[PDB]
């Protein structure tokens, strides 16, 4: 049986009976109550009670109760008033579990003897009514800011109605080691909160409020804090608690469902971790999902275009190297390729492409990917749930699978290959003359452009359905985020679109918004290929002298050799260990993406993010 | 009773049965369902038309129908092939109107009478089925591309099934005439789309692709565009269409939410434009709430804090000149004052504040408004569909009603008498040590996702006015609304997203809330005297600031000089109206605070000097 998931309502934007029945539409079990949604909230406590009962969802726990232990003496009996209140509440709820967070006030009393007075004294109050004290440290408490110090006051208590609480970020933020967990009783935790967030050298509390995610979203080791959890025999509820709101907007159905999401992604990463560290868990109780596929790069972008803008973007394509391969044999569909590069051009109008193209002008509409097994792939992403085409259904006009992702865009699950022959040779015409001009051999990296409050989204869309992994880079800008396919054949650098409101403010007039950013090929002789591409009209930047003098003062390498890459306009990227990028790119095309032509030398694995500010400077200047 | 009020499906984000769902939560009455939902949507048509059946609401509209009229002889029996498959279909949605958009192929032909013949099949096609053709003109179209070619041609084809269809922003874009509506026969007009925008000198095919908005979340003149429409007669489906979008985000409920409550608005809005030019409309159609209250501007700012934050802004405010004016009897509340300022720091735990507190850090937490009219605030605040609560009742601890802000701020409605008097112990002997006089105005740092949503709230609740500002640099445009007569004035800005923090290596992020609060005065010169003296950490502006306005402005004196030695703002109107301004350093990386004088009727913020602020404050670190 799978352990209760369930998530704080203030995760979620929205008024409370929205916040529920998306809760419960995205599967999940329970609910905690946020005191701050009830006291928003026009019903009474017991209608909430009655909301959930219809929803199918129990309230897991009650929250928060703050600054209880180590209060001065002479407020004692007004603090166990205001828990008896509470206490009240719960019952009208239908809940036995309330959240207590540690003391935050600055005259807050900590002897440890003391505080083991009044979480004792709370749990009897508690156990007297038949409800359960649950005590997590924030990680700014005045005396008590840790996990340990919470079961060294819990255990010393010892009265079966008081527990412990974990919250992941609160632990894991103060770097602390969660492998202490395991020596806690499993019954001693009543409950689990799980938090993401990248990490940042900021005040905790800050970092706390403004930058939670969900599981998979950030930089924090998830896994890897659940995992002691689950050594204890700990089989209670998994939680979530992010903080959200009141700004500003947040999508109450696609939050909910991303939450459940990053819960079945924690379990699975969580099970492989017990199995890596030979402390397997029973089966049924994590999430298990087919694993993912392996990756042969990309099989074909498919852009969506109309006949002018079609033939203009064939047009770039040609002088970039590539081949008309053929028409299709009875739609207005292009197909062009250069080396392991297929690309086609979908102009057929009155189609999942046309919709497309209308709804974002020219752009990516799909991407075939190269996958070794086609139905683990789309079994995979069926179990994280999301939508899939079996072929000719829906906007899938291919005879494969497709995948939906967050866009309109679609992900189709190319298995190879036959030889005759493969999916070309049978809805296309092909000139078997064409042959490719250039020597760019295939896609290496393709960078998206994403609206701030999706990325995260997008992030955990590729971590869960397709098991991609993080592949950020510290460089102003320092920090550009990626994500990569386990064997590194798929990469997708992730950047922030422009909002509108800013385009509407700076009275621009020049604004596209979200897609793709670029797309870089590579080549065995970056000089050959600059050649042959400025000279086949092909709009390349041109980089300013003074690149070139940094490089002269930075580098020192063969006089000859430098001037040949500031006449090529060619940049340049060194990592430590001798690798070297040699990689330029062109305008963008009609306003939108770019194409970048990139080669790698002695293993360099980057990049070039040193260049990007040259990169804006130069586009800049048009 | 009133018209048919629907929303077109691309305007929400989600699946199509989110969509539908939150359209009838929303209170609409009818859906244009946009034909690409249908190819995401796993259901059947059917099931679609018995799912609005389920939620009570029609399929008023089926959308869109692409490049038919003009285009090459060769297609056209393949175009009425394509017309035939959706016939097929919007019988199966129970729906019989369907959105025909002018041709935009660059080999259509144009010629006139081609045109006629071919919307004259297209309708008697549609005719045999029981169904109807609606001719919209794009704004981009080859050949049609106005209200007016589009009338000539549904009129010359002369038949019943065949009408006009109109779209505010194809119209108002190209800054079309939309009276001559007038003269179009109210039951040859089958459906109206209402869409709002900001006007921008761009490509209209991206401008209507990006940037539609719900009317009066943009800046075209919506009531003028309804007004001749129902002085034709037409009372059919009154509808929204925006474009989102694709990439995420977009809250499916609010959105809908916010649609409908434009559209109230928008009915209300038309409704005393036909009025104010003497064609009044049968009673009972367009939305008619209560008038808004008249506004003496802001009673008291009501801050969340704890004890040690709250005495430190309080220190803050008593150097700027306010005085102690008492401590509430029972709770951890301090009143301070000014002139008519009244400032709250409120640090009671375990209450409304609290909670803001801990979610926001120093912020504030409500703004209690002087309303000439408690209950008509109270009213046309509900009518609009805003979260009310009685006094002492769930986050309102005050005894007048109060109104949620979006971010769950309040908006108490005070109306003039005593409120001090009653939960605070006043200290008589007070008296501040200012000088200042009265809340000028409060500027609001908002997600750039959200700000839409809050114009809408303070535009149709409130009866705030738009109140913009364009400036030549960056920043060109500001955002600000405005209370009828001005009493309350409400600059809005765009808050940093938290990725962006992220994407850099920032350390102090903190987000959306107050942006600034400015207080106003007789004497800026006097006020800045006495503030240095008293401790508040005013700005020094750099000389080159003042060199800047020796060459923009002519200036006596003299004067430009003592601007300088005072570190004073300054701005100047085309009508000789002044602005004399200062603002102090950011209160724990937070709002800051603003003391200006207004001299000969200058009615702007001095948005010209928002750059040379953000410099001083970044140099100041
Ligand atoms: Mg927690
Ligand atoms: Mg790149
Ligand atoms: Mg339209
Ligand atoms: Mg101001």
Known sequence: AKMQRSIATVSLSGTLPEKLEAIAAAGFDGVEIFENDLLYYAGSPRQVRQMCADLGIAITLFQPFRDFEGCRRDRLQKNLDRAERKFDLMQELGTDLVLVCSNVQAD????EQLLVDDLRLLGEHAGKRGLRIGYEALAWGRHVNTYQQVWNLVRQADHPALGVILDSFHTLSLKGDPSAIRDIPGDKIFFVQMADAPILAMDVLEWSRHFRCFPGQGEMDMAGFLAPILATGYRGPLSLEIFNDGFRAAPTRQNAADGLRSLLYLEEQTRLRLEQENTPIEPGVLFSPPPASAYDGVEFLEFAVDEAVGARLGNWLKRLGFAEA?????????????????IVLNAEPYSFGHNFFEAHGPSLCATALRVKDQQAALKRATAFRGQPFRGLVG?????????????????????????????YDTDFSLDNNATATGGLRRIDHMALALPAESLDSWVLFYKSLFDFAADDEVVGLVKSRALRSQCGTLRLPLNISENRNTAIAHALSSYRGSGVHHIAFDCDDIFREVARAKLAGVPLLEIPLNYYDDLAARFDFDDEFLSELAYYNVLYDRDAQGGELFHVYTEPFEERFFFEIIQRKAGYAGYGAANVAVRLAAMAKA
């Open 108 to 111: 807050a009393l900590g002897d």
């Open 326 to 342: 053929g028409k299709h044999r009875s739609k207005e569909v292009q197909l062009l390729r250069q080396g392991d590069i297929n």
């Open 395 to 423: 906007p899938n006009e291919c005879e494969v699978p497709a995948v939906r992702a967050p866009d309109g865009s679609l992900l189709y699950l190319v298995e190879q290959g036959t030889a005759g022959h493969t999916l």
